[PDB]
Ligand binder design. Sequence first.
Ligand SMILES: O=C(O)[C@@](O)(COP(=O)(O)O)[C@H](O)[C@H](O)COP(=O)(O)O
Ligand SMILES: O=C(O)[C@@](O)(COP(=O)(O)O)[C@H](O)[C@H](O)COP(=O)(O)O
Ligand SMILES: [Mg+2]
Ligand SMILES: [Mg+2]
Lengths: 108, 108, 445, 445, 178, 188, 94
Amino acid sequence: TVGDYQTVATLETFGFLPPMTQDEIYDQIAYIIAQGWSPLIEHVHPSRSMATYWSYWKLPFFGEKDLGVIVSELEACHRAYPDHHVRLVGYDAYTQSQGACFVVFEGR
Amino acid sequence: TVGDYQTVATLETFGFLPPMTQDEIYDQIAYIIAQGWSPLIEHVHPSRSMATYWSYWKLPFFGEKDLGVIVSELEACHRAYPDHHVRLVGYDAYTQSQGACFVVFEGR
Amino acid sequence: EYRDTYWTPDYVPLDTDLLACFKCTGQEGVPKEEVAAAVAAESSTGTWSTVWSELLVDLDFYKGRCYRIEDVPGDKEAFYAFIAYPLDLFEEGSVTNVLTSLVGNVFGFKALRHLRLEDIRFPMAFIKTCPGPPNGICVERDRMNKYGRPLLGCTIKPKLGLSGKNYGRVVYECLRGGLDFTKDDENINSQPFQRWQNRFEFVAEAVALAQQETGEKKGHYLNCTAATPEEMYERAEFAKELGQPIIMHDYITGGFTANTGLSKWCRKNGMLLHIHRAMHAVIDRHPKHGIHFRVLAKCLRLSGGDQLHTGTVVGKLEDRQTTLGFIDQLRESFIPEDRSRGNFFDQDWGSMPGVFAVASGGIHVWHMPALVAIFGDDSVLQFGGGTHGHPWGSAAGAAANRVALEACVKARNAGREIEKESRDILMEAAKHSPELAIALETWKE
Amino acid sequence: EYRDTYWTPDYVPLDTDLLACFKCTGQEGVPKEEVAAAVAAESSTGTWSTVWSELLVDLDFYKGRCYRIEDVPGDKEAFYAFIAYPLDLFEEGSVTNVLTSLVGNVFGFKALRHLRLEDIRFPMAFIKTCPGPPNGICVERDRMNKYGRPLLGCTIKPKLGLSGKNYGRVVYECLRGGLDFTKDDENINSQPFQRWQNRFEFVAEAVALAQQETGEKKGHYLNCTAATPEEMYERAEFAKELGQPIIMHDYITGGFTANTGLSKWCRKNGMLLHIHRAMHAVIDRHPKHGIHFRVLAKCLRLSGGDQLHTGTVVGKLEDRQTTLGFIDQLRESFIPEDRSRGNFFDQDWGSMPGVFAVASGGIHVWHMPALVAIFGDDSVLQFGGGTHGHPWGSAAGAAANRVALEACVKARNAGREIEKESRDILMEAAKHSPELAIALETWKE
Amino acid sequence: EYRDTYWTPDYVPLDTDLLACFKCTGQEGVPKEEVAAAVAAESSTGTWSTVWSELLVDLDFYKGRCYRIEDVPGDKEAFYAFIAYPLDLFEEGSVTNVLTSLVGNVFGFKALRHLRLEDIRFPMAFIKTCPGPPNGICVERDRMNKYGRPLLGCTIKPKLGLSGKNYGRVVYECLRGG
Amino acid sequence: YPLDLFEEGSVTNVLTSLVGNVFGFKALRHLRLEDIRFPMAFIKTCPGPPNGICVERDRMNKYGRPLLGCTIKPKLGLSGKNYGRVVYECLRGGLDFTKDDENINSQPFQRWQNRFEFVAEAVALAQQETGEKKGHYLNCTAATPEEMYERAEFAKELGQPIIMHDYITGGFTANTGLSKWCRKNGML
Amino acid sequence: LDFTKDDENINSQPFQRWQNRFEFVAEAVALAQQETGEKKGHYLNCTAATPEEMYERAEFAKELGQPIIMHDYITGGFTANTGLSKWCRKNGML
Ligand SMILES: O=C(O)[C@@](O)(COP(=O)(O)O)[C@H](O)[C@H](O)COP(=O)(O)O
Ligand SMILES: O=C(O)[C@@](O)(COP(=O)(O)O)[C@H](O)[C@H](O)COP(=O)(O)O
Ligand SMILES: [Mg+2]
Ligand SMILES: [Mg+2]
């Protein structure tokens, strides 16, 4: 029906766009590393999705300059938790903030 | 001695100038009447000089257009009270204020 | 969206409307009706866009309309746009809201190269919701017992440096010599070299010791401008506890929100309020941009304050007709419409008290007959160096102005021409005062 | 009295001084050293007169001095006057005092035809006394959980007319469709057609019912500008009791005194503060008179507020170098000196948090790649009719901007040129959203 | 002291005045202009006496004046007296003051056998100082969500006797039923 | 009527019950409440006069004769200072009370903090010249009860002995709240 | 002399409570200020066990019209010393 817009539940960033291709994850990870940030993986049960602290996996990749490891550490968190959201974060140590924060896997 | 200025006790208006001549009282009274104000005479003991209400004499000259009566009603208040200040006032009925207020006789 | 839905030439403003005058000139080529219509729109509803929501409302009721176009005399590309606003657009007794609505946005709008708010007609329904002066002219003269003549003031100098005790030393000398007010300068707040509880307490002694020696009531406007409103009320309540009659505030830099909160604190506590118009020349000075000071005087009379700086006297701010125009509006209760004094509207204030007109900045003894002929009796005259600049000190300096003022009054009453016989109203006064006789030799002539 | 006692070409400013830049041109014939010296004097001690009292003080210590004269490039009669002020002249943590001193009087002084305050260097000793932003950029993103992208807003229209319940009806539709903020217009205070306790309560329901349906945190800046400071705090405390995260205030019309009292109320109560720069074009717009908006942005970062309007986007306020100049100063912690962006001084803020740069006024869907390339991520984008003006409503309108924003980000990260490939960053996004696919047809192109 | 200093047939009330209507009939024989003038006086300045103090004031400004006399239809000895009052006589946002001034004293005055306050015109300058309804019609319907129909109520009975718990018993039954 | 029908120390309740409704009832053409007998069990719950006759004569020291008063005129027009001018003249000539007229509340031409303060000087300057205690009933009728108490507390702080109120137009609820404020503060 | 001192030990001992010492000193100071014609003082010890108690003694001493007080900053702590030091600026005490 047009035009009847239905409110949809989203995560936050990149939520209105379709799920990312493997090649898109490559370029977002490469951008995160090229800014000098630290990657960090999280996950929750989709019901606890509004908790203030998700769950780590396993420790932030401090000083990692290779994106071929993070694309394999993302299938590990997903296979270990096939009903969890899998978030990707980019830690900024000088500002104490996050330069990136987008869900990669949505939770089967 | 110059220049050693001594603080002097004054009344308020026209206090820094010498005492007025009879001819000066004429012109101030004529100005008071020509504005449409009501003349009013007061007096106090020079010690009670900072009271908020002096003492009338006798009733305000409502609608008096003759200044030859007020110059004779000023010697009466003075002769009756030869140790009092004798003030001259000009009542404004539309503003509820005073358009004039100066001591005429200083108190023998 | 092309307007001329805001150009109503047939409309007759209600008695509850809020009128406004704008001196405007827009882009080259566009007709005047369109460009004044854009001023009507951008200061009220700022529309029409195309939304579903703008049809949930009767927007022909809240729209502001421009009912008259007139031509500026002496200029061709400019015009006068008179615009009417419904009384519902504004909050009651809020002057912060009436300016935020009017001048909040239209000045940035792109089609106008020049726009100046010249005047505003407030309706009697709006005036009665505002606090107004805490006391007024006639109540101040009652509380201080000063009748028949203008009041006199001085501003203590040096502005920067004096301790709390030397300050009170100089305050004591000007008061004991003939003046009845002294002023804190606008800068004096609570600097490291002179905290405010030390200045407030030593002034309270200089005022109370000169009031008893002269036998007249005296005062000093203590500056209660602060960084927070909790701090401002604290200084106000210190000053009232010390038994002081009057304080001071800066309304343009401290804001109308603070000025109105202070103005209504003064009515419950019976204090007087003196207002300083700091940073006025940033807005008001240039003849084609910003607001006229007239409009900021009306908003001040509506918000509060019993005295307001009008200045500026070297030898005066200069035309005189423009100044006498908004002195009327600060003092009178009904002001007709006169274009020479730049009153575009008939303004009725009903029973709201007036505000003292303070003249300031660089007066000397030969300026008295021109400042008594121009300003009248409901004025304050405040010199900075006129008192202090006398060869014999600050008490002999005040004693020379108080003699020259009372000689100019008593010559105005007796029918003489003060602004025309000024030299014999003064040289015949110096025959009976050696303090003025030497002041006339310095500031010659 | 002839000055050049304020023209010190050999002086080297301390690290505790407060520097200032003035773009000036004086009367014809007088040399530049004299006329800049007059600006040095009239903004500090305003002297020398000849008084007995001005010798009770060491006035060579409190004097303001002009240490550099430079020529404006592209103009001949104008010049740049750099003037240094001792730290003792000002009150600590008071921005109302720093402007009252500087721009309080010099603008009326007669020898200058044109004078513009361009910049001010604040010293680190002064910065640490001021409150600053109640939260800042990095704390706001923490409390709201919004990372990696700019925030989005809308201003509810019609400004004039909607009841408390229809207002919340339109607030609910824009929030539930993709935005995360809505705005009270500057006019909305407490008008007869919509009192503030009725607007505050029905918005609190539209915000709380859209936060739960989307699963994201949402807000609405409620306007707590009032006529008194007692009234302003009352609205702030109503809004906090309703559980709301953010409010709004007008600092130029409500004054810095009120703005600083509100800014420190927000720190003890954990609220966010959004600032609207109403009546800025009255002062800031004309290129030779008044203050630059840069200086009023520094004073705002010092007084408080976490977001500040910078506008104005049709298609932008326009040069871009001047705008990017004081966006640096609102956000960065150390800003070098660059004349192209009009920074005359090296300004260090130490550890004081930044302020969000709000772009506003007339954005539409084709402006996203130019407003993401220019402003970056620590920006808010606020349309008035960009959301509401969509053929299918206010929720389908918000859903089209949120899709076009997240398509421009994810193309900036991946190394593409957003402001240069804008049409394929958008047409390839409309292939996966019929809400944007129809928005691109309307606001063509 | 004979009045007809309060009978101004030529006056045109301002938009800030507070008008009033009185249905009156006075003693037998006295003309209507005098007796309506007495109502004008006794509800404002109640004068003139003869005092020194009553000349310290411009009393032609605070006086209330009667600008129109009209005849009651269906009665002969009665008339309608329309009287105008300056806005300065009243306190702002005070309705206790507007009645204390108007009906405070004139009803006891002896020359009138019958006097009835029928109407009052309040000016917009006075209305804006008063608080008014705390909510109103359109805000009550919003807060309660009741649209398109009149509301319904009941008054609990017996008025005298029920405990706090039996009261709530009967309140619960009327509400749960419609 | 049984004593249980009424609230204790409430006169607003005793009239609301009695004359609240019967006057509209249709079968009666004429009805007039002539008298009421109150029982001693009800009288003792009410506040009563804050002072009374014998306590007022004590506090003012006036014995053996009736008291004398005057009502200041013109009612409409006088400033706060001219008011006190006329108050001072009647007191200094032989009376012991003056009265605010019922209309005088806080009109534009004479606010109440200006009338209250200049009367306080006319009363205090005539009390010392005659050597007798003098007073002026200041009208503390207002539009709100918060405003009424504010005027009462201004008048007590100025050292004044007596005030005034309009009970039929201001209501028994306000009149009883003021009447019990006068007992804790010792005012008439 | 122009000052006298409370010893550091004098707080509020059983043999001499502090409201009794504060009040009789206020008379010895006020009766010597008038006889000599010079301003005189006595540092009253407002060191206590709690900060609520310290402020109470400070406000008693100011109400008695006294110009100066005393405190022990090493044993009473800098937290208490700074709270007292800023109470003295709003109240004009030494
Ligand atoms: O420029 C002058 O003429 C004065 O210094 C007076 O000089 P004299 O002392 O020689 O008379 C003015 O008073 C000040 O400029 C400003 O006035 P104020 O400081 O009073 O506000
Ligand atoms: O002029 C325009 O283009 C708009 O009306 C949008 O039109 P559409 O609705 O047709 O897109 C602008 O949004 C407003 O002028 C100001 O913006 P805002 O009201 O958002 O502050
Ligand atoms: Mg001059
Ligand atoms: Mg655009």
